[PDB]
């Protein structure tokens, strides 16, 4: 039996909602899925739905509500408690940052710093639970900052190849 543990960003939902729904309905006793939805994702999908009139972002938020309300077979979903961001230390993110990396992590906008806090919390800190986590994203800036902080990431196509 295997379990995949994913942290899913907003761009993954906006660009790959149809793919994610298929993973959720095709998972079996042999392959179970375990999702963590950070505060970044909820806030960014709300921004996309309101400010960009994104149909896919609006549908993604409704799908996340369905996931959190209903108990799907072989699927676990956890929505981040926003107060966790005030407990996670920025110094714990900096301890995983490659200092030779070209991105100035300390100068990123607050919403991206908090996405990094959520990822580090799962990959390395109290949110780990003895599991191996991957970040799913369709945003190059996010994948590049995640790689500099040793957070493994995958595109929608990467996951589709691992699950097929």
Numbering used by the authors: 1 to 164
Quote from the publication.
Among these, the nonsense-mediated mRNA decay (NMD) pathway is responsible for the rapid detection and degradation of translated mRNAs harboring premature termination codons (PTCs), which can arise from mutations, transcription, or processing errors as well as alternative or defective splicing events. UPF1 is made of 2 structured domains: a CH-domain known to interact with UPF2 and an ATP-dependent RNA helicase domain (HD). Nmd4 is composed of a PIN domain (for PilT N-terminus) and interacts directly with the helicase domain of Upf1. Nmd4 stimulates Upf1-HD ATPase activity and strengthens Upf1-HD binding to RNA.
First, a PIN domain (residues 1 to 167), which is structurally similar to the PIN domains of Kluyveromyces lactis Nmd4 (KlNmd4; ) and of the human proteins SMG5 and SMG6. As previously observed for KlNmd4, the catalytic residue D1353 of the human SMG6 protein corresponds to a leucine (Leu112) in the S. cerevisiae Nmd4 protein. This is in line with the lack of evidence for such activity in the yeast NMD pathway, in contrast to what has been shown in metazoans.
